[PDB]
Structures are given as structure tokens and as C-alpha cells.
Design an enzyme around this catalytic site. Sequence first.
Site, short mmCIF file in Angstrom:
data_model
loop_
_atom_site.label_atom_id
_atom_site.label_comp_id
_atom_site.label_asym_id
_atom_site.label_seq_id
_atom_site.Cartn_x
_atom_site.Cartn_y
_atom_site.Cartn_z
N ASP A 71 53.64 51.39 64.81
CA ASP A 71 53.96 51.43 66.23
C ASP A 71 54.16 50.05 66.83
OD1 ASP A 71 54.27 51.97 68.86
OD2 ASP A 71 52.41 53.12 69.08
N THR A 72 55.41 49.61 66.87
CA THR A 72 55.70 48.27 67.36
C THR A 72 55.43 48.12 68.85
OG1 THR A 72 58.06 48.77 67.69
CG2 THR A 72 57.40 47.84 65.54
N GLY A 73 55.31 49.23 69.56
CA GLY A 73 55.01 49.18 70.98
C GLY A 73 53.53 49.10 71.30
C1 LIG Z 1 49.07 50.25 80.22
N1 LIG Z 1 49.06 49.52 78.94
C2 LIG Z 1 49.78 48.39 78.88
O1 LIG Z 1 50.43 47.94 79.82
C3 LIG Z 1 49.82 47.72 77.50
O2 LIG Z 1 48.78 48.24 76.66
C4 LIG Z 1 49.34 49.06 75.63
C5 LIG Z 1 50.30 48.24 74.80
O3 LIG Z 1 49.57 47.75 73.66
C6 LIG Z 1 48.24 48.36 73.63
O4 LIG Z 1 48.09 49.01 72.34
C7 LIG Z 1 47.89 50.43 72.57
C8 LIG Z 1 48.61 50.71 73.86
O5 LIG Z 1 50.02 50.65 73.59
C9 LIG Z 1 50.75 51.77 73.83
O6 LIG Z 1 50.25 52.78 74.35
N2 LIG Z 1 52.02 51.77 73.41
C10 LIG Z 1 53.00 52.80 73.75
C11 LIG Z 1 54.10 52.12 74.56
C12 LIG Z 1 53.53 51.57 75.71
C13 LIG Z 1 53.50 50.19 75.89
C14 LIG Z 1 52.96 49.66 77.05
C15 LIG Z 1 52.42 50.50 78.02
C16 LIG Z 1 52.50 51.88 77.87
C17 LIG Z 1 53.07 52.41 76.72
C18 LIG Z 1 53.59 53.41 72.48
O7 LIG Z 1 54.24 52.37 71.74
C19 LIG Z 1 54.58 54.51 72.86
N3 LIG Z 1 53.86 55.76 73.16
C20 LIG Z 1 52.42 55.52 73.01
C21 LIG Z 1 51.87 56.26 71.80
C22 LIG Z 1 52.36 55.57 70.52
C23 LIG Z 1 50.34 56.23 71.85
S1 LIG Z 1 54.16 56.29 74.70
O8 LIG Z 1 54.48 55.11 75.62
O9 LIG Z 1 52.92 57.03 75.20
C24 LIG Z 1 55.54 57.40 74.67
C25 LIG Z 1 55.33 58.76 74.49
C26 LIG Z 1 56.41 59.63 74.37
C27 LIG Z 1 57.70 59.12 74.37
O10 LIG Z 1 58.76 59.96 74.20
C28 LIG Z 1 58.30 61.28 73.89
C29 LIG Z 1 57.92 57.76 74.50
C30 LIG Z 1 56.84 56.90 74.68
C31 LIG Z 1 48.24 49.47 74.66
#
Ligand SMILES: CNC(=O)CO[C@H]1CO[C@@H]2OC[C@H](OC(=O)N[C@@H](Cc3ccccc3)[C@H](O)CN(CC(C)C)S(=O)(=O)c3ccc(OC)cc3)[C@@H]21
Lengths: 99, 99
Positions: free
Chosen positions: A25-27
Amino acid sequence: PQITLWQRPLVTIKIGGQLKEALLDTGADDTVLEEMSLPGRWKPKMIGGIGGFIKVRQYDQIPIEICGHKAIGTVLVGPTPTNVIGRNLLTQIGCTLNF
Amino acid sequence: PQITLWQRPLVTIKIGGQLKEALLDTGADDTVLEEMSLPGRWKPKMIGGIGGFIKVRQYDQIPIEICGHKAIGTVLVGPTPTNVIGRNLLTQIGCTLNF
Ligand SMILES: CNC(=O)CO[C@H]1CO[C@@H]2OC[C@H](OC(=O)N[C@@H](Cc3ccccc3)[C@H](O)CN(CC(C)C)S(=O)(=O)c3ccc(OC)cc3)[C@@H]21
Ligand SMILES: [Cl-]
Ligand SMILES: [Cl-]
Ligand SMILES: [Cl-]
């Protein structure tokens, strides 16, 4: 390997003696796993994504094996709907995006 | 390009003639942008993340440029914390994970 993105990029990880399926998960900044036991110190943390925040336990310096690749880093444990491998561990195995 | 993961993989996208920053997110099935205006009719969708679910507006067949690469597809608009480019468009621009 070269991992296509037609399907969710799921892999098997080895952590704390256990095998688990997780999403590459690059996000995600951090690796977040469903409830499990890990050894050593931990501290509470809030992490947020779509839909808001959850409370997790932060364990540091945890050994993990991903696709035969050993690495060490921080693992967050709590009520995530799915196990994700975040950048903090993807870097260690030399994972890049390419296009 | 080859993008490493030591920092967030933020790229510039272009949509409706405007530049935005967005995260290349292999853990996201779909592409979700912060509130904005798009043309045409929209359909309802509920998407779930780490903290639960949100309601978004689904727009189909929207032109969007990602790092200069042209795509046309489904864009979800709602109260996401950050713009995320999911696999629906990452596949259109030929993105893979590699290690
Ligand atoms: C508020 N928080 C912040 O600012 C930063 O804190 C974040 C970042 O890094 C940290 O690590 C764990 C968490 O990261 C994420 O949760 N990452 C999210 C992206 C994202 C990145 C930043 C903020 C919010 C989400 C996922 O990579 C994508 N999806 C989550 C799934 C993989 C758990 S999705 O987004 O839920 C979604 C679901 C369905 C869809 O289509 C169907 C498309 C997308 C923290
Ligand atoms: Cl770490
Ligand atoms: Cl590197
Ligand atoms: Cl699409």
C-alpha cells in the site's frame, strides 16, 4: 517481481511467528495490521485515513519477511479493516512504482 | 518514471483544467478527490477506509492527467483527507510495483 495492479497487490508476510495476507500500500505511511500479539515495548497512536481515525499500538523494530525479503520496522496494531504494508517497510525491500 | 517510497508518492494531476496534488495509492481500488466540481450526473457510492465509511459522488468517464499521463475514467469526489489515485487509474497509466 513486477506486480500488476489489475488486482489488489496482496502478499504473504511472516511476522511474530505468524503468516498473514497483506496489501502492498503505497498510500500508507505506516504498516497497519489487525489485532495480534507482538513482543517488546509499545506506545498508543492515532492514525487516520478515509473515514477518520483509529487507535493503534505502535511497536518498533519488529522483524518481518515479505516475499522472501527480510526487513525491520515499526508495526501498528489495531482495528484496521485490512492488513496493509506501508512505505516504512516497502522501502526496505526496494519497492518502487514504475510507469 | 521510477518512484521510490522514502517520501509520499505525491504527483501533480490535472482535472477540469486545474492542477492538484495527489497520492499514488496502490492500496486504493478507486480514485477519490477532495470536494470539487465536475460535469454531468453523478451516482452514489460508499467507500470504506481505515476509520470507516464515507459517502462520495461517483463521476464516470472523466479525463484526468496523472504525471502527464492521460487517463479517462471514474473519479469519486468526497470528504477524503487527501486526493488519492487508485488502481482504476494506475492501470490506465501502466503503473506497476517492482522490487
Ligand atoms: C488522515 N490520515 C492522514 O492524513 C495520513 O495518515 C494516513 C497515511 O499514512 C498512514 O498510514 C496508514 C494511513 O494511511 C491510509 O489510510 N492510506 C489510505 C490513503 C489515505 C492517505 C491519506 C489519508 C487518507 C487515506 C490508503 O492508501 C487507501 N485506502 C486506505 C486503506 C488502504 C486502509 S482508502 O483511502 O481508505 C480508500 C478506500 C477505498 C477506495 O476506493 C474504494 C479508495 C481509497 C495513515
Ligand atoms: Cl519504521
Ligand atoms: Cl532506494
Ligand atoms: Cl475507471
